[PDB]
Each structure stands twice: as C-alpha cells, then as structure tokens.
Amino acid sequence: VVEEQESRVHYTVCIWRNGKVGLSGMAIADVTLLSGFHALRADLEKLTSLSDRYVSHFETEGPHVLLYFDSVPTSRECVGFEAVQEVPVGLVQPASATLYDYYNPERRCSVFYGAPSKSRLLATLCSAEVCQCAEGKCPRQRRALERGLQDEDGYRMKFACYYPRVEYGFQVKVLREDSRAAFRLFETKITQVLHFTKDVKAAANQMRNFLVRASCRLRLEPGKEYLIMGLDGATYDLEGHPQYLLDSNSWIEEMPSERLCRSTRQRAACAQLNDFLQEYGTQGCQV
Amino acid sequence: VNFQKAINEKLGQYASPTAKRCCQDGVTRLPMMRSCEQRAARVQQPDCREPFLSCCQFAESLRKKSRDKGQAGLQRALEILQEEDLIDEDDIPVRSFFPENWLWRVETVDRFQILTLWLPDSLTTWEIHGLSLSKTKGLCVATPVQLRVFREFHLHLRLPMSVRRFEQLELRPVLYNYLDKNLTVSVHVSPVEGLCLAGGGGLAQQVLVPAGSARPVAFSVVPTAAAAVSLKVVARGSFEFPVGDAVSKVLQIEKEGAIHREELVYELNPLDHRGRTLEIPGNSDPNMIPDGDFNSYVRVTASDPLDTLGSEGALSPGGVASLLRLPRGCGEQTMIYLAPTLAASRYLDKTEQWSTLPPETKDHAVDLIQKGYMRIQQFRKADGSYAAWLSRDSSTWLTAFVLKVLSLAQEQVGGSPEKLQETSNWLLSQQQADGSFQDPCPVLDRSMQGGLVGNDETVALTAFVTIALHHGLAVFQDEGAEPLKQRVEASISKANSFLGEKASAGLLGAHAAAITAYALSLTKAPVDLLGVAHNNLMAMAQETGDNLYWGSVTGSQSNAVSPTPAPRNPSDPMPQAPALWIETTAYALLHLLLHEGKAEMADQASAWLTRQGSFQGGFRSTQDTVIALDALSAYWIASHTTEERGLNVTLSSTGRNGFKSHALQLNNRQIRGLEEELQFSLGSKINVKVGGNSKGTLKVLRTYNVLDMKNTTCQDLQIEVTVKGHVEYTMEANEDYEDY
Amino acid sequence: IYGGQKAKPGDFPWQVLILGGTTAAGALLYDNWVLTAAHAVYEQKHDASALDIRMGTLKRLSPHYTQAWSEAVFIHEGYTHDAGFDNDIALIKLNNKVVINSNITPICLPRKEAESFMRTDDIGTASGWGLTQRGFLARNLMYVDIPIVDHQKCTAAYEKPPYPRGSVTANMLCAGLESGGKDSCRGDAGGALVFLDSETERWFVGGIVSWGSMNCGEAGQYGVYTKVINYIPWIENIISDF
Amino acid sequence: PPDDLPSGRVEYITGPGVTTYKAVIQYSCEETFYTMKVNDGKYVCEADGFWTSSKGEKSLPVCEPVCGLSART
Numbered sequence A: 001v002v003e004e005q006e007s008r009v010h011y012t013v014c015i016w017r018n019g020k021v022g023l024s025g026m027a028i029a030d031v032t033l034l035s036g037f038h039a040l041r042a043d044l045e046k047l048t049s050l051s052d053r054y055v056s057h058f059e060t061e062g063p064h065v066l067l068y069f070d071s072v073p074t075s076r077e078c079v080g081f082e083a084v085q086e087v088p089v090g091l092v093q094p095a096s097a098t099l100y101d102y103y104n105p106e107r108r109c110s111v112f113y114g115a116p117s118k119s120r121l122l123a124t125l126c127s128a129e130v131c132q133c134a135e136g137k138c139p140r141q142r143r144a145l146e147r148g149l150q151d152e153d154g155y156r157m158k159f160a161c162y163y164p165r166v167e168y169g170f171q172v173k174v175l176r177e178d179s180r181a182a183f184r185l186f187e188t189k190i191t192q193v194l195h196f197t198k199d200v201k202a203a204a205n206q207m208r209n210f211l212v213r214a215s216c217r218l219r220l221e222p223g224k225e226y227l228i229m230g231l232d233g234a235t236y237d238l239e240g241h242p243q244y245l246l247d248s249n250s251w252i253e254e255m256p257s258e259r260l261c262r263s264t265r266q267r268a269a270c271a272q273l274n275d276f277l278q279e280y281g282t283q284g285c286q287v
Numbered sequence B: 001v002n003f004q005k006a007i008n009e010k011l012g013q014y015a016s017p018t019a020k021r022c023c024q025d026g027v028t029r030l031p032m033m034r035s036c037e038q039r040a041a042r043v044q045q046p047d048c049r050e051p052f053l054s055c056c057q058f059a060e061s062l063r064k065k066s067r068d069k070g071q072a073g074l075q076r077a078l079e080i081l082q083e084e085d086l087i088d089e090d091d092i093p094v095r096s097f098f099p100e101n102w103l104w105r106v107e108t109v110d111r112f113q114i115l116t117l118w119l120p121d122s123l124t125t126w127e128i129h130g131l132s133l134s135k136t137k138g139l140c141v142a143t144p145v146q147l148r149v150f151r152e153f154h155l156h157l158r159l160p161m162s163v164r165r166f167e168q169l170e171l172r173p174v175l176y177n178y179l180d181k182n183l184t185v186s187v188h189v190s191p192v193e194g195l196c197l198a199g200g201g202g203l204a205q206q207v208l209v210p211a212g213s214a215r216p217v218a219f220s221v222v223p224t225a226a227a228a229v230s231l232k233v234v235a236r237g238s239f240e241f242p243v244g245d246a247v248s249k250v251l252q253i254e255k256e257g258a259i260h261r262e263e264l265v266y267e268l269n270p271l272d273h274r275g276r277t278l279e280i281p282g283n284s285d286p287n288m289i290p291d292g293d294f295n296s297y298v299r300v301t302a303s304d305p306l307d308t309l310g311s312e313g314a315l316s317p318g319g320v321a322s323l324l325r326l327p328r329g330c331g332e333q334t335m336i337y338l339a340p341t342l343a344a345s346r347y348l349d350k351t352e353q354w355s356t357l358p359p360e361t362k363d364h365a366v367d368l369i370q371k372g373y374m375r376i377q378q379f380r381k382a383d384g385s386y387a388a389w390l391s392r393d394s395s396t397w398l399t400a401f402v403l404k405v406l407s408l409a410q411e412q413v414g415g416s417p418e419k420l421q422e423t424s425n426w427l428l429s430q431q432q433a434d435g436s437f438q439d440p441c442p443v444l445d446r447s448m449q450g451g452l453v454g455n456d457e458t459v460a461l462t463a464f465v466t467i468a469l470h471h472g473l474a475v476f477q478d479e480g481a482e483p484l485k486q487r488v489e490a491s492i493s494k495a496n497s498f499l500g501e502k503a504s505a506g507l508l509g510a511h512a513a514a515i516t517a518y519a520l521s522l523t524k525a526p527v528d529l530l531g532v533a534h535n536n537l538m539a540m541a542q543e544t545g546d547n548l549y550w551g552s553v554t555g556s557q558s559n560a561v562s563p564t565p566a567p568r569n570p571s572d573p574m575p576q577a578p579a580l581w582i583e584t585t586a587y588a589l590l591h592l593l594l595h596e597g598k599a600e601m602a603d604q605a606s607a608w609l610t611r612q613g614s615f616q617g618g619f620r621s622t623q624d625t626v627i628a629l630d631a632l633s634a635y636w637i638a639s640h641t642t643e644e645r646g647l648n649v650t651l652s653s654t655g656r657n658g659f660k661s662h663a664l665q666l667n668n669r670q671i672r673g674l675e676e677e678l679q680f681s682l683g684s685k686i687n688v689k690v691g692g693n694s695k696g697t698l699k700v701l702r703t704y705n706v707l708d709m710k711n712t713t714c715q716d717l718q719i720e721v722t723v724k725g726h727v728e729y730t731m732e733a734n735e736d737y738e739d740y
Numbered sequence C: 001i002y003g004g005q006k007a008k009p010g011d012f013p014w015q016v017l018i019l020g021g022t023t024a025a026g027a028l029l030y031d032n033w034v035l036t037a038a039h040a041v042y043e044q045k046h047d048a049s050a051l052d053i054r055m056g057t058l059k060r061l062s063p064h065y066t067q068a069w070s071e072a073v074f075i076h077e078g079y080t081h082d083a084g085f086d087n088d089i090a091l092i093k094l095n096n097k098v099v100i101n102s103n104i105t106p107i108c109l110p111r112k113e114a115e116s117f118m119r120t121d122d123i124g125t126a127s128g129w130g131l132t133q134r135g136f137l138a139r140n141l142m143y144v145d146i147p148i149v150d151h152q153k154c155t156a157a158y159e160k161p162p163y164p165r166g167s168v169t170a171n172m173l174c175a176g177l178e179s180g181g182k183d184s185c186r187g188d189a190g191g192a193l194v195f196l197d198s199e200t201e202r203w204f205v206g207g208i209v210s211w212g213s214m215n216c217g218e219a220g221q222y223g224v225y226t227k228v229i230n231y232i233p234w235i236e237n238i239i240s241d242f
Numbered sequence D: 001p002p003d004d005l006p007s008g009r010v011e012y013i014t015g016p017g018v019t020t021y022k023a024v025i026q027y028s029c030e031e032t033f034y035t036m037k038v039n040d041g042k043y044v045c046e047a048d049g050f051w052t053s054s055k056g057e058k059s060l061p062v063c064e065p066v067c068g069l070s071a072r073t
C-alpha cells in the first residue's frame, strides 16, 4: 500500500487490583479494538522485549489484543501502543475490554471504551445518497404538526392501522437522557395511553424506556411531551417493564404547545391531531 | 544525523555488550509516556540499571532539546513528525516471508507425461525443480525451468476484520497498473442485499490509472444486516482493452453491543419425582441490546463420558484446546493438548470403546499429543527445567507438571527417556532440608483470601512434585534402576515425611489437603499417614443433595448463619463453582478411587464434576480442566457398565417461530455434540419433561450483546482503557507544560 | 511568530490553529470559511475532514477550544506543490457555522481601495503559534508589528545565495525589519498579515504567511507573504458557488 | 409565536407575548458581533396569519457576522 492517509490512534490500558484478595496470579487483558483498526506490532514488542518488563506476551489474532500480565498490582500500571486504521470506518461504536485472572476466571472485570471525543471517527463518512439510504431504518424526525410531502389527509390513522400498523400507542413526557453503548436511552413517563399489546398494566405516571441507535439523527429533549407509537420490542428494564426501540416503524412527534395550537395556521392541523387521538384512543383500528 | 552521532557517542562510553544492551534499551522510547527515572526503576539488575538510567536521561534530554528543530526548508509551515529513533547496529531484517511451494509432489511418469496446472498469482518469477527416481536407472536431477508470472492489471480490496452494523465504511479498492500505457477503468461494486450502496449497487465509476501507478477508488457503504455479506468489486477496462479484475470478499458485520455469555447446567433426574418436570425461565437481562433476534442453545446428554472424551470432545480434530475457548500462549497451557488427550485415550483403551467412534479418532489423538510435545519442548531449559515463557526464569512447578504428563506420552511421540531422566534430576535438586520443594517463581498462587499462604503453597507444591515424581518412575529402565531410581524414591519418601507431619499437624487448606491425600494415595504411603490424611480431608467435605464437593470460606458477613451448603433444588440450576473448587474436588475424587474405589462418595463427587463442566467442553481454565478430566476419566473407567441405561426427555418452548417441541431418545451408547443441540428463543421459557431409569445432564448457553456492564462486575480487579488521537498524543508526548 | 510578544484575549479573534500532517495557522472568513496557505494544507488535501481546526483560544496546548470540522478543501489551481510558493493560497470550508463571540470574529477581506493602507514602511501585524526567539514552538499566541518592504528591495534580497530562481513573484508582498529580529517562523504558515483600515477602524488581511529565509529573522532577509487582493474574485467565486 | 432567529433575539413591541392581528415585533441580531441584512427586522402580524416585515416579506431576516473588531488599542 501507499499513502491513502491512514488514521492512527494511541491506546492506554491501565490495570490494578483493589484489596489483597486474589493476590498475584497470571492475568490476561483482552482488548477488543475499534472497528477497522489493528494494533501496531512494532510498539507492542517494546513492552516485552526491552529490559523493562511491562508485559510477558501478546497476541494480535483478529480485532483483539491479548496481553499477558504476570501479576496485577495494587497501584496503577499502564500499557500503551499505537493502532492504525487500514480501511476508513466512520461513526465508530464503543468496544469492550476485559481483564481476568487466568486460573480463576470468576475474578474478572469488563469495561466499555469509546473513540476520543471530538475525533473524526465519530463523524459520518456516507455519500449523500448513502446517508439517505442509511436513515431508512431510522425513525422519522418531524416537529409539531409538520406535514410531509407525501402525507395525505388521515396520515396518522393510516400509519396506526394500515402500515406499518402500530402495536402500541403512548403519550409520554421525556424525563432524562442516558448514553449507553451505541445507543441513547430516554427515560420517560407515560401521560396518556392509546393502545398496547404486550405492555399490560401500562398507565399514566408509569415509566418506560425508549431507545434509539446512535447512528440515527433523532433526539428526544427532556421536558417535552411526545406522541410515540410503534411495535413492541423484546427487551425489559430493571423493574421488569418492557423497553421500546425507535426505528423507521415508529411514529414520534412532539405535541404542540397551547400557544402554537391556537395559531390561525396550525389551528386546523392541531384539530386533526386531537381528533385522531380521541378517535384512535377510544375506538382503535376497528374502522 | 546529529541525533545518531550523539547516541552512538553515548554508546561508545560503554565497552561491555551487557552495558551496551542496557544502554540501547534506555535510548529506545517507550510507547506510553513513563518518566525516565520511573521507567528505569523497573530493571532487575542494578549493574544494568546504572547504564540504563544514564542513557535514558541523556536520550530524553537530547531528544527534547533537538525537538521541533528538524525538517528545515524555506516554507513557514512545520511538519509534525515523531521523535527520532536510534538506527540499530544490530543485524538488518532480511525478507523472511515467501509464497508457499505449490507443485510440491511426486508423480509416476511413464516415459513422458503432461500436467495441467493452475498458476498461483505473484509478481516474482519462479523456477521449477525436479528429481527422477527410477528403479533401474537411478536418481536424476532435472535442470531448472523458469516460469514468470506477471499481472497486466491488479485489483486489491481491503476490508476490516470486524465491523459493527450501521457504522459508516468507505472501502478503498486499489487499482494496480503494471502496463506501460495509461489505462481508464470502469469500476463498480456488485449489488447485494444488506448493504446501503451507491445507486443501490452497481454504480459505475470511471477512474484513470496511469502507467506503472496505483489509484485507490472510494466507495461509500454502510451495513444494515446482522449476519455476513459477501461483496464483490468489479473492474473492467474500457475501449478494446480486455484488462480487468474482480475481487469478492466476505465482510463480517457484528451486532452493536458487547458479547455476554451465560452458561447454566441442570441436573436431569427422573428417578425422583421432583426432577421429572422442570422449567427453565429464559432470559430477560436489562442490559441486552434491542433487536438482534437472539437464540438460546440447549444441549441435552445422557452419555456424559463419550460426549466429553469422544469425537465431539477431547478427541475432536482440534481437541479440547478449541473447546476450552481461552488463549493458550503460555507454557503451562500446552498440556491442554496432552493431559486431556491422554485421559481420553485411557478411557477408550480400558473400556475397549475405540470401535464405536470412527477409526480416524486415533489419528486425531496422536496428532494432538505430538503437537503438544513439539510445542512444550520449546520451553525446555538447558539444565532440563522448564520456564513459563521463553528466556524466562525456570519454574519448579511447571517442570513438575511437564514430567507428570510427558512421562506417559513419550512412547507415542518419539520422545527421549534420557531427557525426562535429566528433568527429574533437576526437580530433586530443588528439595529443601525439611523435605519440601521450593519454586523461585511459581506459575500458580491460588491460595488467596484464605490466610497462611506460605503453609498452603509449600505443601501443595511439595505434593504436586511428588505426584509428578511418581509418574516419572515409569520412565526408568535398567540403566537408571540403581543410580537415579533410588534417589527419586528416597526423595519421595523424604517429602512424604514432610507431608505426613503437616497433614497430621492439620490446619491445611482444603486444596492443600486434597492434593496431599492424592499424593499419599498415589504413592503407597504408610497406613497411618494414609488414613489420617483421608480423615483430615473428609472433615472439610461439603455435601448437598447427591453432590459432594470441597470449597473455601470467604470470611463472614458479620454475625451470619452457619449452614452454608444448605439450599439445593433439582429444579434450580447447578451453580458454576470457581476454578479452585473444581481442582480441589478432582484431587479428592482421584484420592477416593485409590483409597476406597467406586463408592457412594466417589459417585456423589464425580456427579458434581459431571454437572460442573462448561457448555462446550472444558471447565473453568486449563489447570482445572486437565485435573478434572483426569479425575473423571478415572471414575468413568471404574463405573463403566454394559447396561443400556438411558432416559426420555421432551423439550418445548413457545418461541418467535411458533410452538416447537422435541422428543429425544437418550442412552449411554450415543455420542451427542454440536450438531444435535437445540435452538430456542432467548426470551421464551422452555419446559422440560424427563423420564427414564438413569440420571442425565442438561446445559443451556445464552449468548447475547449487552449495551452496559453489570454494577457488580469489577469488585476486585480493575481495568481502564483510554485512547487519544495521534496529533493529540504526540504533542502530549513532546509536552513541556506547567513550566517554562 | 519570531521575536514578538504575547497576545491578550481579543487581540486576534480571527486566528485559527490547523493540525494535520503539518502545524499551521489560518484566518476565519465569515462564519464558515478559513483562509490559509496552500502549501500548509496541500498535505492531506483530498481527505476533507483530515484537518483538526481549533480556534477561539490563545494557547496551543489548551484542552478547551472551539472545534470546527472541514467539509471540503480548496487549493488554488495556480499553485504547484513541487518547489516554490507562487499562488500560495487555500480556502477551507467549515461544515458547521462558527459561534461568533468575544474571542471569535472573522477578519475582513481587503477592499480594492485598501492598498492606501498597505503602503511601504507602514506597520502591519502578524500573529500565530510559531518557533519563538528561544527556538521552540510558542505555548501561547505571539505577534509582531512589522513594516512593509518595497517589492524591488525584497526581490533584490532573494534568489541568492541558496534560494532558487523565480522564488519571488508578482503575487507576493514582503515585510520585516532591515536588521532582522521581527519575522514569522516555522508554524505560522497560513496566518494573517493584518492591516488597520483607519477610516472604518476595522482590520483586514492583506497578506498570508508563506515563506522566507530558512533562518528566521535573519538580517537582510524579509518574510514573504501571499498578496490577497489579487485573488478577491477567486475567493468570491468559490464561496458563492461551492 | 415568532420564528426564532439564528444568532438573534425577538422583542415584543406591542406587549408581552401578544401575537394577534396588527401586533408588532422587533427582531434584533446579537449586538456588536452580528449585523442584520435584507431588512431591518420590524414585523407585524398580517391578516393571513403570517408575520410580515415592513417591506411585505413573510420570511425571516438574516444575521451577518461583523468582521474585524480587534481588542488592540
């Protein structure tokens, strides 16, 4: 190969042991590299071959870096090495790294790590038409009472009952946003229930979790009230309530404020929304 | 240049090669930015530390003084470049990788013969050699004939090893032109499902490639599938030029989260009515990523010995090493190719069960043992000892483990009995005056949480060496019967006296007592020590249900209740014990078979080992696997019968693909493995109905991707990983900050 | 900047620090364009977002700064990246609009009647993080006030002894003391040579830090800057059409 | 409600939050750092439900950065 302007980063892996339990013993540091990157072999040999014994052995098979430590110290001991991206991958997702006692694998520790903040690896690399294809699985982003170019009259009822045929319909207030591995989590409180299937005993003041992939450009700001309807997922939260994924088969729309709804332009459109909520929330899809 | 002269001038101050090597390591810049004095404190020899510190201090001072000065030119911009490295006076690296020798064969040729061949690609011309062997006319060496392989136009595609779905990926196929003419090529990627691609795939792009040049072509793609996609790039020369090439490769696309493994095992007992019907609750983990469509895998077996040691177990083509699923770079891990394979052969030999398995298993077995012998001998020191790593200090423990295993395997691998006699002589030199053995750098420590570590380690090491020395007695013949065999037997007796008084004194740990009992049972210790060691070990036994195991006390939660092994329930899963417990009860089971034979305590212990094995093969790690398989193989030889015992099991679950139900006929004669495992939905519960005249074992494997780690994952050990950009890291490496 | 003094907050709110294969500087134009030299940015020119663009801070080593992402890089077609700096000018387009505030305001493009302020011996200002008088890169922003040098006087001082022929051209202007001591140095390329429009009390960039003597601030040698006013239609054509 | 202005503020001239017919609002870009173009930002609520400028345009004004403005004395 030649030139191509390769992307290079520098890793830093620190390990230590709290308490005197499980003292010493050989441990293995398993680092799953970010997508597209492979660890630089030259710097890894410096940890073991020099007069400084920072590692006893290393394996680089696959996107994994296996580090063999003779013992885990009480104070921090850190190891670093370069990594080079052979093929440019953007919008990189965080990966896991694991340190475990080899002869006692029950004593272990796994942690997530992500790309450096304000790095170009977090920015997209899609060509214009590819980005439009990319969000084909992403939920539609619209402000209050916004009409799409193809949204004919009765679009909310068509989405709910014809295609993609909604399985759950809620009216929630976003409380707090959390960032998980490759996903953004919105903690919400249900204010009104329109329809449900798997989520029995879903009611007002009940709390649910709504997740969306980090790739999608949708963002639910806390303090606002949204109409959310889609298909029920397969996961559950810490209390036992089901969790919801927001994708292209989910309808998310912030509900208009009192000041905006009584505006002359949006008064007719705001009536369609409330007429739909009363129609669907009462009689459902039995048209 | 000036940096090279000054560093070599500093090296010239040290005449000894030891001082030069310690100095050359000092001038080499460590990857992570550790302080020079902080870094120099690590080296273990003060005679090496003094020149290492002086050269490291001079190199860093010189490098920072010369920093930011280089790359002279009329331009007013400054190129960012890493710090100059010393150009080694060591030997230069000559190329070492060459294409594999195709056409390495021998063919019967009558007068003349023509071979149709397909040429592997390369840019280097090669020559073909030939040797003729005739019974009447003898050997003849053919004159070499040249064959030059060349490429008019070459397409090369690179793609990452692992890509998470919905990551933005710009693949860069490179067009290589070896022709002396400019070439215009039409390149495109074939359309394939699961990839958002320009124009829906098949979008032509016109690229001009100059003569004798390379040109990367940029295509944008993002994977939306969750499996694996084979993408094919097609390049064709325009006009009347027939040049063109196509490359097809598979891109592995993974789910977003990180892999999480959950392994639960269930006892199958139709003899008691409580185990005839049991429910498996499925999974509902709160950290599992959405979507994915994960599955749950179930393995139901009533033929535990054959499934563990048969064609689907220890005698698989890859052996147990691929089933244990851990990296095996260390030296001790080499015995995973040996000790389990030897135990698997011992079970099939003593039960005459080779005819049931396919006959190629014996070829698989000898290949694994010879593979282990060939690998472990690389760690052998000059004096017959073995080290954990190459060029590392010798370990007394590892040297004993090698003698314990290679004594059995040397006959079939072509080993040398002389080398094993040299090995045992080194172990004898490590015996102290008390009779205990001592290791300056043991591989395993284990004895933690529980105090009095020196007492447990020395006793456990001594018992482990004696067990190794007893297996080494099988190597000796008439040559070593008088000089060496008498020394080893006296060394075993001297160490048994140490183990005897420590066993009689008591207060040994559960692990130390178990290995002592097997050491004093493998070697025919006197009846007084043989009995008191058994009574001492049985006082530490824990019994629950039909299981017998040996554990350890993890302190006390202030004022807490006493009956710790109280709860048990055949409808509940069998909890996976730590590696220390598996190794302790394995030694106790081996001690039980020699002291008492097949008994109810041997049955209860071995049944616990059988229900403690992992899903796809071994136990917790390498050391516990080789000893547990050694113990279970000895039990399965003792408890083997010709009865057709089995069981009937019916499994059903309402998955996402509808209600599925499977009815299985299980008995002792079968070999059940990967191809027989069932698939159910991750979230859906599974219902199992058991019936028959013999007990069995059911294992479930639930592997899925999580978006967060547990809150209790890192109680003891800690790992922290951070990453910085190259421009951010280099400026931070050459940093002079918080000063002036 | 070689032989200067340390700037205070607000002195050069248009200064941009560019990091990539090279350490260089730039000047903000409007709220989404960066003016810089072509030779400094030609490195990794076809990788759009390769450049780390930092602005709104006075220290190069600072962890806190305003980040900008490049959407595309435009190099003047007259430039030849072999040897020489004829037509050394480049425009970088920022993907997001910069938040104009107290520490970030763009530099004005020169008017056609602004050459009344770019007369010989009149004082101009250069600023950037470059090799200081002590020999290392500046940890905080530095600047000099230097007079413009006559074009004939500047041409006579070049092409000898080591410099190649045709190094000075009509697309350049020069500045610096006759005795030396005030000059730009390695790392200031792309920085703005700004002048004060006293009629409007506004600052505009008239020159772009380009090249000079390899020994910075040498007596009898002057810094050479790319003259902006020759490329005003080229700047407007790229901004309006791209 | 008036459409928010990038790098600008909206001021109610007629009264606090009154958006009805014939009410007047005054747009203002952030002072010193920005200047306004196209129009001067005086908008009145028209009978059709759209905020209209003094010129009769229904779209927002645009704020333009003010170049220069150095702190040197």
Ligand SMILES: *[C@@H]1O[C@H](CO)[C@@H](O[C@@H]2O[C@H](CO)[C@@H](O[C@@H]3O[C@H](CO)[C@@H](O)[C@H](O)[C@@H]3O)[C@H](O)[C@H]2NC(C)=O)[C@H](O)[C@H]1NC(C)=O
Pocket (backbone or CB within 6 Å): B182, B210, B211
């Ligand atoms: C085949 O490909 C090569 C490489 O792309 C082409 O070489 C290029 O040819 C042009 C035309 O001769 C060169 O431009 C000229 O350069 C000379 C100085 O060498 C200058 O005096 C002229 O005014 C003109 O600019 C160009 O430099 C050269 N490429 C390189 C990298 O030097 C070649 O032209 C192609 N063949 C055909 C038939 O087009």
Ligand SMILES: *[C@@H]1O[C@H](CO)[C@@H](O[C@@H]2O[C@H](CO)[C@@H](O[C@@H]3O[C@H](CO)[C@@H](O)[C@H](O)[C@@H]3O)[C@H](O)[C@H]2NC(C)=O)[C@H](O)[C@H]1NC(C)=O
Pocket (backbone or CB within 6 Å): B646, B647, B648, B691, B692, B693
């Ligand atoms: C597991 O279940 C299978 C059947 O699902 C059991 O095999 C069955 O064994 C019984 C007793 O050996 C056989 O009984 C015979 O049935 C015929 C037909 O009614 C009758 O004429 C005979 O006199 C005798 O009673 C039965 O045929 C046989 N089933 C099949 C399909 O062959 C097996 O014994 C069960 N194993 C365990 C361990 O529970």
